[PDB]
Design an enzyme around this catalytic site. Structure first.
Site, short mmCIF file in Angstrom:
data_model
loop_
_atom_site.label_atom_id
_atom_site.label_comp_id
_atom_site.label_asym_id
_atom_site.label_seq_id
_atom_site.Cartn_x
_atom_site.Cartn_y
_atom_site.Cartn_z
N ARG A 1 13.79 44.18 31.79
CA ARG A 1 13.07 44.59 30.43
C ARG A 1 13.72 45.27 29.54
N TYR B 1 -7.57 47.45 34.25
CA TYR B 1 -8.67 47.10 34.47
C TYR B 1 -9.92 47.08 33.44
N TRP C 1 5.74 51.50 25.67
CA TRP C 1 4.44 52.03 25.47
C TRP C 1 4.04 53.03 26.41
N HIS D 1 2.05 52.27 42.34
CA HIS D 1 2.76 50.99 42.49
C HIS D 1 3.58 50.74 41.05
N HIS D 2 3.60 51.45 40.01
CA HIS D 2 4.36 51.32 38.65
C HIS D 2 5.51 52.50 38.93
N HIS E 1 -3.09 52.40 35.18
CA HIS E 1 -3.79 51.28 36.07
C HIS E 1 -5.09 51.03 35.55
N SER F 1 -12.06 58.20 20.23
CA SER F 1 -12.69 57.03 19.79
C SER F 1 -13.29 56.25 21.08
N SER F 2 -12.37 55.96 22.11
CA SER F 2 -12.95 55.50 23.31
C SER F 2 -13.78 56.39 24.28
N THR G 1 -11.72 40.91 43.84
CA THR G 1 -11.38 39.98 42.69
C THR G 1 -11.37 38.40 43.01
N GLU H 1 -6.45 51.65 33.02
CA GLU H 1 -6.45 50.98 31.80
C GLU H 1 -6.32 49.38 31.89
N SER I 1 -18.24 35.28 33.00
CA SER I 1 -19.25 35.15 33.78
C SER I 1 -20.58 34.55 32.88
N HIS J 1 4.06 46.52 19.61
CA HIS J 1 3.67 45.09 20.11
C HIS J 1 2.45 45.56 21.11
N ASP K 1 -31.09 49.94 19.22
CA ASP K 1 -29.44 50.18 18.95
C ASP K 1 -28.89 51.05 20.10
N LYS L 1 -14.91 37.19 42.78
CA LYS L 1 -15.49 36.80 41.50
C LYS L 1 -15.04 35.45 41.09
C1 HEA Z 1 -3.24 42.60 25.40
C2 HEA Z 1 -1.81 42.69 25.45
C3 HEA Z 1 -0.61 41.84 25.18
C4 HEA Z 1 -0.64 40.40 24.50
C5 HEA Z 1 -2.01 39.60 24.21
C6 HEA Z 1 0.84 40.05 24.37
C7 HEA Z 1 1.15 38.93 23.73
C8 HEA Z 1 2.39 38.38 23.82
N1 HEA Z 1 3.48 39.31 24.25
FE1 HEA Z 1 3.63 40.85 24.96
N2 HEA Z 1 3.79 42.77 25.90
C9 HEA Z 1 2.70 43.70 26.10
C10 HEA Z 1 1.11 43.19 25.92
C11 HEA Z 1 0.92 42.02 25.25
N3 HEA Z 1 1.81 41.00 24.94
C12 HEA Z 1 2.83 44.88 26.62
C13 HEA Z 1 2.15 45.96 27.41
C14 HEA Z 1 4.43 44.98 26.90
C15 HEA Z 1 5.21 45.59 27.51
C16 HEA Z 1 5.84 46.70 26.40
C17 HEA Z 1 6.88 47.77 26.99
O1 HEA Z 1 7.73 47.42 27.72
O2 HEA Z 1 6.89 49.02 26.48
C18 HEA Z 1 4.76 43.67 26.39
C19 HEA Z 1 6.12 43.02 26.31
C20 HEA Z 1 6.50 41.77 25.73
C21 HEA Z 1 7.74 41.29 26.12
C22 HEA Z 1 8.98 41.77 26.79
C23 HEA Z 1 9.73 42.78 25.70
C24 HEA Z 1 10.94 43.25 26.37
O3 HEA Z 1 11.01 43.62 27.89
O4 HEA Z 1 12.14 43.52 25.92
C25 HEA Z 1 7.84 39.95 25.42
C26 HEA Z 1 8.82 39.07 25.40
O5 HEA Z 1 8.51 37.95 25.35
C27 HEA Z 1 6.39 39.91 24.99
C28 HEA Z 1 5.94 38.56 24.37
C29 HEA Z 1 4.75 38.44 23.77
C30 HEA Z 1 4.15 37.03 23.30
C31 HEA Z 1 5.05 36.05 22.80
C32 HEA Z 1 2.69 37.22 23.19
C33 HEA Z 1 2.01 36.17 22.59
O6 HEA Z 1 1.50 35.24 23.73
C34 HEA Z 1 0.99 36.41 21.36
C35 HEA Z 1 0.14 35.30 21.05
C36 HEA Z 1 -1.00 35.68 20.07
C37 HEA Z 1 -2.05 36.19 20.42
C38 HEA Z 1 -2.47 36.18 21.73
C39 HEA Z 1 -3.13 37.22 19.62
C40 HEA Z 1 -4.26 36.65 19.77
C41 HEA Z 1 -5.52 37.53 19.41
C42 HEA Z 1 -5.87 37.69 18.13
C43 HEA Z 1 -5.09 37.72 17.27
C44 HEA Z 1 -7.77 37.91 18.03
C45 HEA Z 1 -8.14 37.05 17.18
C46 HEA Z 1 -9.19 37.33 16.24
C47 HEA Z 1 -10.44 37.16 16.71
C48 HEA Z 1 -10.84 36.12 17.91
C49 HEA Z 1 -11.66 38.04 16.48
N4 HEA Z 1 5.73 41.01 25.36
C1 HEA Z 2 -5.47 42.57 32.15
C2 HEA Z 2 -4.41 43.37 32.89
C3 HEA Z 2 -4.08 43.57 34.15
C4 HEA Z 2 -4.61 43.20 35.44
C5 HEA Z 2 -5.92 42.80 35.82
C6 HEA Z 2 -3.58 43.42 36.45
C7 HEA Z 2 -3.82 43.34 37.81
C8 HEA Z 2 -3.11 43.28 39.01
N1 HEA Z 2 -1.66 44.03 38.70
FE1 HEA Z 2 -0.59 44.27 37.06
N2 HEA Z 2 0.22 44.84 35.41
C9 HEA Z 2 -0.24 44.78 34.25
C10 HEA Z 2 -1.31 44.11 33.81
C11 HEA Z 2 -2.26 43.84 34.59
N3 HEA Z 2 -2.41 43.80 35.91
C12 HEA Z 2 0.69 45.46 33.39
C13 HEA Z 2 0.41 45.65 31.87
C14 HEA Z 2 1.71 45.73 34.15
C15 HEA Z 2 2.94 46.46 33.64
C16 HEA Z 2 3.06 47.75 32.87
C17 HEA Z 2 4.56 48.29 32.42
O1 HEA Z 2 5.15 48.45 33.14
O2 HEA Z 2 4.49 48.24 31.11
C18 HEA Z 2 1.33 45.48 35.39
C19 HEA Z 2 2.17 45.90 36.26
C20 HEA Z 2 1.90 45.57 37.72
C21 HEA Z 2 2.78 46.21 38.97
C22 HEA Z 2 4.03 46.92 38.82
C23 HEA Z 2 5.25 46.07 38.70
C24 HEA Z 2 6.57 46.76 38.51
O3 HEA Z 2 6.51 47.48 37.29
O4 HEA Z 2 7.51 46.95 39.27
C25 HEA Z 2 1.99 45.93 40.02
C26 HEA Z 2 2.45 46.43 41.26
O5 HEA Z 2 1.73 46.15 42.32
C27 HEA Z 2 0.84 45.37 39.69
C28 HEA Z 2 0.19 44.60 40.36
C29 HEA Z 2 -1.37 44.06 40.00
C30 HEA Z 2 -2.38 43.65 40.84
C31 HEA Z 2 -2.17 43.50 42.58
C32 HEA Z 2 -3.15 43.24 40.24
C33 HEA Z 2 -4.59 42.69 41.00
O6 HEA Z 2 -5.60 43.24 40.28
C34 HEA Z 2 -4.71 41.19 40.77
C35 HEA Z 2 -5.85 40.64 41.57
C36 HEA Z 2 -6.10 39.28 41.47
C37 HEA Z 2 -5.58 38.01 42.34
C38 HEA Z 2 -5.12 38.47 43.68
C39 HEA Z 2 -6.11 36.59 41.84
C40 HEA Z 2 -7.42 36.07 42.21
C41 HEA Z 2 -7.94 36.49 44.00
C42 HEA Z 2 -7.97 35.11 44.77
C43 HEA Z 2 -8.19 33.69 44.21
C44 HEA Z 2 -8.32 35.64 46.20
C45 HEA Z 2 -7.25 35.10 47.33
C46 HEA Z 2 -6.14 36.19 46.98
C47 HEA Z 2 -4.88 36.68 47.81
C48 HEA Z 2 -5.58 36.41 49.42
C49 HEA Z 2 -3.63 37.00 47.78
N4 HEA Z 2 0.84 44.94 38.23
CU LIG Z 3 -1.24 49.18 37.85
#
Ligand code: HEA
Ligand code: HEA
Ligand SMILES: [Cu+2]
Ligand SMILES: CCCCCCCCCCCCCCCCCC(=O)OCC(COC(=O)CCCCCCCCCCCCCCCCC)OC(=O)CCCCCCCCCCCCCCCCC
Ligand SMILES: CCCCC/C=C\C/C=C\C/C=C\C/C=C\CCCC(=O)O[C@H](COC(=O)CCCCCCCCCCCCCCCCC)COP(=O)(O)OCCN
Ligand SMILES: CCCCC/C=C\C/C=C\C/C=C\C/C=C\CCCC(=O)O[C@H](COC(=O)CCCCCCCCCCCCCCCCC)COP(=O)(O)OCCN
Ligand SMILES: CCCCC/C=C\C/C=C\C/C=C\C/C=C\CCCC(=O)O[C@H](COC(=O)CCCCCCCCCCCCCCCCC)COP(=O)(O)OCCN
Ligand SMILES: CCCCCC/C=C\CCCCCCCCCC(=O)O[C@H](COC(=O)CCCCCCCCCCCCCCC)COP(=O)(O)OC[C@@H](O)CO
Ligand SMILES: CCCCCC/C=C\CCCCCCCCCC(=O)O[C@H](COC(=O)CCCCCCCCCCCCCCC)COP(=O)(O)OC[C@@H](O)CO
Ligand SMILES: CCCCCC/C=C\CCCCCCCCCC(=O)O[C@H](COC(=O)CCCCCCCCCCCCCCC)COP(=O)(O)OC[C@@H](O)CO
Ligand SMILES: CCCCCCCCCCOC1OC(CO)[C@@H](O[C@H]2O[C@@H](CO)[C@@H](O)[C@H](O)[C@@H]2O)[C@@H](O)[C@H]1O
Ligand SMILES: CCCCCCCCCCO[C@@H]1OC(CO)[C@@H](O[C@H]2OC(CO)[C@@H](O)[C@H](O)[C@@H]2O)[C@@H](O)[C@H]1O
Ligand SMILES: C[C@H](CCC(=O)O)[C@H]1CC[C@@H]2[C@H]3[C@H](O)C[C@@H]4C[C@@H](O)CC[C@]4(C)[C@@H]3C[C@@H](O)[C@@]21C
Ligand SMILES: C[C@H](CCC(=O)O)[C@H]1CC[C@H]2[C@@H]3[C@H](O)C[C@@H]4C[C@H](O)CC[C@]4(C)[C@H]3C[C@H](O)[C@]12C
Ligand code: CUA
Ligand SMILES: [Mg+2]
Ligand code: NA
Ligand SMILES: [Zn+2]
Lengths: 259, 84, 79, 98, 46, 43, 514, 227, 58
Positions: free
Chosen positions: G438, G244, G126, G290-291, G240, G156-157, G316, G242, G255, G61, G91, G319
């Protein structure tokens, strides 16, 4: 007709054959590692070589023969190569990180010391030092080659380039012998692990770099390069310097400090 | 640093060839002298079945699965000791 | 004698969450001490402190494996 | 110590690379490598926009340092003005390849 | 020269909306069904 | 944005067909697997 | 002609189209996997089996959603289609290599599906942490096929990043400086730089796992003096950046969408937006641990990572407030794209703030490996990244196809998805605070209510995905051809018609230097 | 343990967990504030026919929305870091207990004086006694003395696992070849639950932790009886 | 050796509408068919291997 200086490439089958060859090699490795069979791997390595050969052949046709490499196209190719080298540096960085992580805090299983108990490191003053002078020397000779080419001297460009390649080959042969002579193996804990995987990937790059230089050598023989336009050679030289620099770090970290 | 030599009035092809043959290659010749001197097969150490060495978590995909890729019988013992 | 031990006290040399080296250090110390004493004609009772500390901190399987290795001649640590 | 045998761009450059090279020697820019300098942009002194068809997209950076670029097609005929700052542009069509 | 314009710059045909419906159904349907069948595959092995 | 009228208008009836077919292509295969889930677990 | 065009392409628009198709298909796979997850958690007890089959599902997933859906769509699809058009380029710099970046994805996907087919699959998470991912706890080809899938996606990336960076730096009009390029182009370049630097570290790390599994190395094996924690560092050093990489292009599209539908000619505080994306990109490289707040790290190290992580909220925040300031005083067009953008701004902010809660190592001790983290990342990914993808898709669909969508249906689609995602993830905050771990196929009885509601929410989302497919079909079935588009003076990509011809900018734009 | 429909944290059992509850209240307020403020401003920007589409100057308002967030971050970090260092203070424990993770159960070792050790498995759902919690009960609980500073050492003998007890604010990963330390101190007697917090394979969901906190006197007799 | 670049430039600029990868002559066509055949065949074979490995051989 276009009024910009960029290159619109003819539809090509190489990207696809390259992608599939990637699939055949990875699949091949899996079949080899688990189902004891090299068939897929063999085909994969073959299509891969075929793809690279034809793709770069076409690049030579497009530039030397058709004139598509205007200064703007060449400028882009420069950025491309620099960016490629940077990603290679980060790749090696992961291996140096692994090396330092292990060596700086030796676990109890190693005897809590580095090198681990039972490991007898090679003498850095012996072949490793020789290898170092070989690569540094090839760095000088390839610079001589570049200046010769730019000054329009065909004979000396070929001479210097030949010397550079011989040195690269010498390094490769010395390293191959070092590998065979080493009392430790890749299976000898994290020491052997970091040693062989890091120097092994470096050795692979030396082979790639040498190959690239050899390609330049033959293109030079066929008069492809002009005193001013020779990007393939410049890229090979940059790549060669990268290889040379990665070695200096390996030498200082693994062979010297890590002993 | 500045080395201990001089030129710099204009670094060209003649200068780099001067360096290739006057410094670089001679250095390689000296190191080749030194290496093909300090070589000589050093007495292979007594075997001790240390558990952090001769690792085998899965057999190698070649030979009998128990020999490293560039296995040298003279200096590389197997998990059970040196070979015959 | 000078004992009355509850558990291994805080050791400033190992103040962090990773205590792997604390266990290991005390195991080495005890076996080094035990060797010096049994050698030069003395009493192992002086080595007691290290044995208590390492016994408290070290996982049974680690102590067990290390003991088997000291016996097999494959203990990587210097004793 | 020295000699020859290495071709020059003048002797061996071909295709588009050669065209760019020769045009550059005559001080011309048929392949739009250079950024054109602006005229006063008035009705009497419009910016002359070369083209090989009857329309070309113009991008106007109204004031130096603006991050926003104003884009529009400049058609053959009477001079047109930037929708944002009003400076004038007039298309001067065809040729390039003789 | 390749065809240009609406419905011509794509790898699938939009000439017939019903044939199109069938194509899209197979395309998206196959993607959505894959995990279910892979799951079934893993359950029927042991 | 302005656009011309549909070249091949899709009527409400046609839309119900497309929607139904779409929903079914997602629901049926999965439904089939999920239904026979017990037949899979132990067989 | 068909094969020449779609298999041997050297055109940025056609390649971008292949990417959008691949990504849409991957999205269906990722959706099915997500429904399998929530069906299992829908009621107490075991539905599919033990944690293995369940975790093979959770793992796929994540990989599918991340590597095959989000990245291909945002960078490969929107990136290839829009970047050259937005800078007036004919291009990409390396149009042939660009095609290989695309063709490496299907093989990469096939390798992922293979790993789940052979043996018992890779039920590792993952993150693929050893020893569970090692040759003893996960013997067989599964984890190796997963590693290889990542390698291909990685090549690829990395090649794509080299292409984008070169294209953006080298192929702009001679008079256009980097400070005159649109924010989406900036978002793509910064994303490419992060990809260029982070993926090679991941490649190094997973190659080490591959050798530990097959060549008897012991990088992560204590027996040979290795450390499982070393792998974590290497993974997260990439991990991390990734996240961003997954949000930056979204920020870029947001934007453009907000500016466009606010009837504005430019986003508020352009230079502040550029600064913000660059700062976020930089900071995203020095916060990875932080992970790893529970692995047992020194307190000082934990104090540093807590602080460095929080600082990201500043750029952030600039923005968020700039998007609001772009709305300010605008002639608001309530289009479906704008609705996705507004939902993005709010929901992303929520997920970002819970991310700031997690940044505190003290609290993270209790929140780590619980559903509170799952709630955080789904808000930023399943609401943030996905909403930006949907907004950009509806906004640019007419440009790519030459046809219009039915606005009413698109608004209905937004409404359904909005309810579905919030019903799915909001209750997960509760499950997290109360301690639900989890990666569990079953949970203690007390957690039943919120898990039931969350699974229901996931079904609402399925309904929205199916509807989306229908909507795209309706657009192509009715064939309403585009006539006029407003604001083309500040949206160059629309200036060549809908769809633009195969060859655009054969004669480059004219831009005075003054 | 968690109760049906629980919204927040399990009630604090140790002084540190209490500390975190207050820090969380503090932070959550800020989260509610900022997210509601953003939702509000969005609605504000979208509810007027008045317009201003010309160029707006940025270097002035950007100061406000850079300085305010920076201040708020500091207001979160101070108490966060204070608690972080508190959890790290030297305390000198009265007892040391070790726990090794395994696929799939925990084993415990109290080897300060005697060599006491035992395995701890989840009670199968089919063997639960009436009133017992599904997925949470174990055959052998971790009996520990209440109101005393205890040192817990955590490791693993196979894959990664993670030893957690939410009520006490504990979670320490179980890594093979490593010995992680944490301190435990319960303010009350009772039974405190937790679950394996690192994916470890087939039965990751089924290897719980149950702590039994009794007075020292009962802890001692239990230790003796357990030899 | 002698400089024959001019001959090669004439051959590759010859207006025959052939894409650069085939513009060299009949050999290009052969090499291409060899490459593509190995690629496609090898891919089919890999699919076969996956089918094989998907099932247990107890
Ligand atoms: C982009 C990343 C992404 C997205 C979108 C989602 C979407 C969803 N995920 Fe998540 N999920 C992860 C990334 C994501 N997830 C990751 C990283 C983990 C952790 C795995 C791990 O622990 O190892 C996780 C884990 C995870 C868990 C926890 C599993 C566990 O700990 O046991 C659950 C539980 O409910 C869950 C549920 C869902 C659900 C219900 C949605 C739904 O909201 C989905 C709804 C459908 C969509 C949003 C798809 C839409 C997009 C398109 C189809 C493109 C369409 C085409 C065009 C427009 C060109 N996800
Ligand atoms: C789109 C993907 C995305 C993005 C952008 C971020 C953004 C951030 N993430 Fe997250 N994060 C994930 C995807 C993402 N994360 C995933 C996938 C995991 C789990 C991975 C795994 O274990 O599988 C995770 C896990 C994760 C952890 C680990 C938790 C744990 O496993 O115990 C932490 C720890 O600090 C964290 C922090 C943050 C923070 C601080 C930001 C910041 O960048 C957010 C900043 C934004 C704001 C703060 C809001 C806007 C700001 C304002 C309105 C201004 C005022 C705000 C203040 C004064 C507070 N993230
Ligand atoms: Cu991180
Ligand atoms: C779906 C299930 C709902 C169950 C609800 C509670 C039942 C209580 C019984 C009975 C209630 C009284 C008795 C128990 C009190 C317990 C106090 C406790 O231990 O305290 C801690 C607890 C409980 O916190 C609470 O005190 C509940 C707070 C709920 C806030 C809800 C916002 C909801 C918006 C729309 C509905 C939800 C879906 C969409 C959410 C969209 C994102 C917010 O745990 C939390 O921290 C949970 C939230 C985590 C953080 C999310 C942060 C940003 C959220 C929203 C910003 C919206 C701003 C604009 C305003 C909102 C605009 C939309
Ligand atoms: C312990 C670790 C162990 C591992 C270590 C291993 C190895 C060590 C490391 C390196 C050594 C290896 C090789 C070095 C030899 C040659 C490299 C080639 C450089 C060269 O020769 O560069 C030239 C000029 O400099 C130029 O490019 C300048 C222009 C550069 C453009 C590309 C960069 C763009 C990418 C992103 C931009 C970054 C932005 C900076 C600001 C950010 C603030 C935070 C070529 O010209 P060009 O591209 O047309 O540019 C036009 C500018 N004159
Ligand atoms: C002569 C110097 C040059 C080195 C390379 C030359 C020949 C080896 C073949 C391929 C090597 C290419 C890369 C390195 C990969 C693994 C490390 C190999 C370094 C090496 O060759 O190490 C040898 C081990 O061989 C082994 O297992 C090697 C087993 C060979 C199988 C290769 C395994 C393939 C795994 C490749 C992973 C690919 C992933 C890369 C991804 C890149 C980014 C996406 C050392 O021999 P030993 O007997 O243990 O000790 C000597 C005792 N007398
Ligand atoms: C088993 C090991 C394997 C060995 C290593 C592997 C590979 C090395 C490969 C190739 C290099 C070797 C020789 C090159 C051969 C012929 C060059 C032909 C041109 C020539 O003869 O060049 C001359 C100089 O070369 C010359 O002495 C040739 C120079 C030879 C230099 C090295 C000899 C060193 C002698 C001892 C000195 C040591 C003292 C140290 C002093 C301190 C240093 C700072 C200059 O002449 P010209 O009149 O200006 O030029 C007219 C146009 N050609
Ligand atoms: C770089 C410029 C910015 C400057 C900021 C500083 C940041 C990094 C550089 C510092 C590295 C050296 C520090 C080592 C000193 C401590 C020695 C040590 O011991 O640290 C060790 C690991 O260091 C290790 O590998 C360290 C391995 C390296 C990790 C850092 C990652 C960054 C690399 C990517 C950057 C790309 C650069 C491109 C190259 C040209 C082990 O960890 P401990 O926790 O001690 O475990 C021991 C326990 O038993 C007791 O608790
Ligand atoms: C046993 C050996 C097999 C091992 C596998 C790899 C084998 C060989 C790799 C060696 C690379 C050979 C590259 C040959 C490239 C030839 C095409 C070339 O050099 O093309 C040049 C452009 O550069 C260009 O595209 C520059 C092209 C850049 C290519 C460099 C990439 C290196 C590849 C590395 C791949 C592995 C990665 C690492 C693994 C972990 C053409 O322009 P000019 O030279 O200016 O000519 C024009 C003038 O004539 C005008 O008057
Ligand atoms: C487990 C095993 C995993 C194996 C994965 C293997 C993946 C693929 C294998 C097959 C790929 C090889 C085929 C040759 C590729 C050559 C690309 C190249 O040389 O691309 C060039 C651009 O990149 C440039 O210069 C500079 C960049 C040069 C890049 C060379 C490509 C090497 C591919 C490997 C990358 C590894 C990443 C390294 C970090 C770990 C030229 O660009 P084009 O668009 O073609 O033309 C533009 C025209 O104007 C030229 O006249
Ligand atoms: C990212 C770039 C890297 C891509 C992957 C690198 C590919 C490396 C290929 C290694 O392949 C080989 O494998 C073998 C095993 O199949 C060998 O044969 C051998 O193995 C045997 C088969 O059991 C024996 O019969 C022989 O003694 C012999 O040593 C062997 O010589 C060698 O060519
Ligand atoms: C997470 C995504 C899944 C969402 C839930 C799916 C929604 C329902 C889909 C309907 O699916 C089906 O319905 C059936 C039952 O109503 C089945 O019939 C079956 O059951 C029968 C009647 O009970 C028989 O007539 C047939 O043999 C048959 O196998 C079955 O094949 C299947 O196509
Ligand atoms: C034939 C050619 C002269 C220029 C020309 O081709 O017309 C000569 C000049 C310099 C080259 C040589 C250089 O002197 C370097 C090499 C030295 C020799 O020991 C072996 C071959 C060697 C690799 C070269 C072969 C030779 O055929 C070259 C290629
Ligand atoms: C100087 C530079 C570019 C200005 C321009 O050339 O147009 C601008 C762009 C964004 C500005 C930054 C952002 O507005 C964010 C910060 C805002 C505070 O008001 C001052 C520092 C602050 C860090 C700014 C400093 C500086 O004025 C920046 C960096
Ligand atoms: Cu043990 Cu999860
Ligand atoms: Mg964890
Ligand atoms: Na379940
Ligand atoms: Zn203007």
């Amino acid at each position: 007709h276009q009024t910009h200086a960029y290159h619109m490439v003819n539809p090509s089958p190489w990207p696809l054959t390259g992608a599939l060859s990637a699939l055949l090699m990875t699949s091949g490795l899996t079949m080899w590692f688990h189902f004891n069979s090299m068939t897929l791997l063999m085909i994969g390595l073959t299509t891969n070589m075929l793809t690279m050969y034809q793709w770069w052949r076409d690049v030579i046709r497009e530039s030397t023969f058709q004139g598509h490499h205007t200064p703007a196209v060449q400028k882009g190719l420069r950025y491309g190569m620099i960016l490629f080298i940077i990603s290679e540096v980060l790749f090696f960085t992961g291996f140096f990180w692994a090396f330092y992580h292990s060596s700086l805090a030796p676990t109890p299983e190693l005897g809590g010391c580095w090198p681990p108990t039972g490991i007898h490191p090679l003498n850095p003053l012996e072949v490793p030092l020789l290898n170092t002078s070989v690569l540094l020397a090839s760095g000088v000779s390839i610079t001589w080659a570049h200046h010769s080419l730019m000054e329009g001297d065909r004979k000396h460009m070929l001479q210097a380039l030949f010397i550079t390649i011989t040195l690269g080959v010498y390094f490769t042969l010395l390293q191959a012998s070092e590998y065979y002579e080493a009392p430790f193996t890749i299976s000898d804990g994290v020491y052997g692990s970091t040693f062989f995987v890091a120097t092994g990937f470096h050795g692979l790059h030396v082979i790639i770099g040498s190959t690239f230089l050899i390609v330049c050598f033959f293109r030079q023989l066929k008069f492809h390069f002009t005193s001013n336009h020779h990007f393939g050679f410049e890229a090979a030289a940059w790549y060669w310097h990268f290889v040379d620099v990665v070695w200096l770090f390996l030498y200082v970290s693994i062979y010297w400090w890590g002993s | 640093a500045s080395a201990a030599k001089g030129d710099h009035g204009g670094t060209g092809a003649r200068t780099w060839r001067f360096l290739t043959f006057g410094l670089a290659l001679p250095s390689v010749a000296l190191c080749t002298l030194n290496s093909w001197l300090h070589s000589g097969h050093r007495e292979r150490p007594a075997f001790i079945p240390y558990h952090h060495l001769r690792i085998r978590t899965k057999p190698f995909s070649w030979g009998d699965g128990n020999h490293t890729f560039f296995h040298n019988p003279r200096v590389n013992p197997l998990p059970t000791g040196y070979e015959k | 004698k000078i004992k009355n031990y509850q558990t291994a006290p805080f050791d400033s040399r190992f103040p962090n969450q990773n205590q792997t080296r604390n266990c290991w250090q005390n195991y080495l110390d005890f076996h080094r001490c035990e060797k010096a004493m049994t050698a030069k004609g003395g009493d192992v009772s002086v080595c007691e402190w290290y044995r208590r500390v390492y016994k408290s901190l070290c996982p049974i399987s680690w102590v067990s494996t290390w003991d088997d290795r000291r016996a097999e001649g494959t203990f990587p640590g210097k004793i | 110590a020295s000699g020859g045998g290495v071709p020059t761009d003048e002797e061996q450059a071909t295709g588009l690379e050669r065209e760019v090279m020769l045009a550059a020697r005559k001080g011309q820019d048929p392949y739009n490598i250079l950024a054109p300098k602006a005229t006063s942009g008035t009705k009497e002194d419009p910016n002359l926009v070369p083209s090989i068809t009857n329309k070309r997209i113009v991008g106007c950076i109204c004031e130096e340092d603006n991050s926003t670029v104003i884009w529009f097609w400049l058609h053959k005929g009477e001079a047109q003005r930037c929708p944002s700052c009003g400076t004038h542009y007039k298309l001067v069509p065809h040729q390039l390849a003789h | 020269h390749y065809e240009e314009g609406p419905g011509k710059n794509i790898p699938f045909s939009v000439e017939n909306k019903w044939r199109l419906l069938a194509m899209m159904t197979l395309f998206f349907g196959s993607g959505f069904a894959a995990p279910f069948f892979i799951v079934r595959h893993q359950l029927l092995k042991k | 944005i302005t656009a011309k009228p549909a070249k091949t208008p899709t009527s409400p009836k046609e839309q119900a067909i497309g929607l139904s077919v779409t929903f079914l292509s997602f629901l049926l295969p999965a439904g089939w697997v999920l239904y026979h889930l017990d037949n899979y677990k132990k067989s | 002609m068909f094969i020449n065009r779609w298999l041997f392409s050297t055109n940025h628009k056609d390649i971008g189209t292949l990417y959008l198709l691949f990504g849409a298909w991957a999205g269906m796979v990722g959706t099915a996997l997500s429904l399998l997850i929530r069906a299992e958690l829908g009621q107490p007890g075991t539905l599919l089996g033990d944690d293995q089959i369940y975790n093979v599902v959770v793992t796929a997933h994540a990989f599918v959603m991340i590597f095959f859906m989000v990245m291909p769509i945002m960078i490969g699809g929107f990136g290839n289609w829009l970047v050259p058009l937005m800078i007036g380029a004919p291009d990409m710099a390396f149009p042939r290599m660009n095609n290989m970046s695309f063709w490496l994805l299907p093989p990469s996907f096939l390798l992922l599906l293979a790993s789940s087919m052979v043996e018992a699959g890779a039920g590792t998470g993952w993150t693929v942490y050893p020893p569970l991912a090692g040759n003893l706890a996960h013997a067989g080809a599964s984890v190796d096929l997963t590693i290889f899938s990542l390698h291909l996606a990685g090549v690829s990336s990395i090649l794509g990043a080299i292409n984008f960076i070169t294209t953006i730096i080298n192929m702009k009009p001679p008079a256009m400086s980097q400070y005159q390029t649109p924010l989406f182009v900036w978002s793509v370049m910064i994303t490419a730089v992060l990809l260029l630097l982070s993926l090679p570290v991941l490649a190094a790390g997973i190659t080490m796992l591959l050798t530990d599994r097959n060549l008897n190395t012991t990088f992560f094996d204590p027996a040979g003096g290795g450390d499982p924690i070393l792998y974590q560092h290497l993974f997260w050093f990439f991990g991390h950046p990734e996240v961003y990489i997954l949000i930056l292009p979204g920020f870029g599209m947001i934007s453009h969408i907000v500016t466009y539908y606010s009837g504005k000619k430019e986003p508020f505080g352009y230079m502040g937006m550029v600064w913000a994306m660059m700062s976020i990109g930089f900071l995203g490289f020095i916060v990875w641990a932080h992970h790893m707040f529970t692995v047992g790290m020194d307190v000082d190290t934990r104090a540093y990572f807590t602080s460095a992580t929080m600082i990201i909220a500043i750029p952030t925040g600039v923005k968020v407030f700039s998007w609001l300031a772009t709305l300010h005083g605008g002639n608001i067009k309530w289009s479906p794209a704008m609705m996705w953008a507004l939902g993005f701004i709010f929901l992303f902010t929520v997920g970002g703030l819970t991310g700031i809660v997690l940044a505190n190592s003290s609290l993270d001790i209790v929140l780590h490996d619980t559903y509170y983290v799952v709630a955080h990342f789904h808000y930023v990914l399943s609401m943030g990244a996905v909403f930006a993808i949907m907004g950009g898709f509806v906004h640019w669909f007419p440009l790519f196809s030459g046809y219009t969508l039915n606005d009413t249906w698109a608004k209905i689609h937004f409404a359904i998805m909005f309810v579905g995602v919030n019903m799915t993830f909001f209750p997960q905050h509760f499950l997290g605070l109360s301690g639900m771990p989890r990666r569990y196929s079953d949970y203690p009885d007390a957690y039943t209510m919120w898990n039931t509601i969350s699974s229901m929410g996931s079904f609402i989302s399925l309904t929205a995905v199916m509807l989306m497919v229908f909507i795209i079909w309706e657009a192509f079935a009715s064939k309403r051809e585009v006539l006029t588009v407003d604001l083309t003076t500040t949206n160059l990509e629309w200036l060549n018609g809908c769809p633009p011809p195969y060859h655009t900018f054969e004669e480059p734009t004219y831009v005075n230097l003054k | 343990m968690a109760y049906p429909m629980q919204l927040g944290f399990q009630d604090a059992t140790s002084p540190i967990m209490e500390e975190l509850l207050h820090f969380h209240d503090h932070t959550l307020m800020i989260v509610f504030l900022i997210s509601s403020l953003v939702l509000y401003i969005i609605s504000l920007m979208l509810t007027t026919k008045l317009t201003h589409t010309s160029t707006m100057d940025a270097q002035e308002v950007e100061t406000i929305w850079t300085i305010l967030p920076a201040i708020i971050l500091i207001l979160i970090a101070l108490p966060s870091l204070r608690i972080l260092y508190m959890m790290d203070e030297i305390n000198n424990p009265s007892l040391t207990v070790k726990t090794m993770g395994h696929q799939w159960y925990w084993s415990y070792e109290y080897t300060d004086y005697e060599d006491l050790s035992f395995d701890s498995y989840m009670i199968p759902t089919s063997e639960l006694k009436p009133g017992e919690l599904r997925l949470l009960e174990v055959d052998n609980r971790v009996v520990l003395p209440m109101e005393m500073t205890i040192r817990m050492l955590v490791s693993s003998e196979d894959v990664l696992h993670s030893w957690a007890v939410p009520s006490l604010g504990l979670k320490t990963d179980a890594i093979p070849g490593r010995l992680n330390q944490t301190t435990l101190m319960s303010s009350r007697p009772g039974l405190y639950y937790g679950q394996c917090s690192e994916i470890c394979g087939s039965n990751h969901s089924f290897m719980p932790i149950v702590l039994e906190l009794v007075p020292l006197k009962y802890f001692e007799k239990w230790s003796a009886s357990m030899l | 050796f002698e400089n024959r670049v001019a001959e090669k430039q004439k051959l590759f600029q010859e207006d025959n509408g052939l894409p650069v990868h085939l513009k060299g002559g009949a050999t290009d066509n052969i090499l291409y068919r060899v490459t593509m055949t190995l690629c496609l065949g090898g891919t089919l074979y890999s699919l076969y291997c996956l089918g094989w490995a998907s099932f247990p051989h107890k």
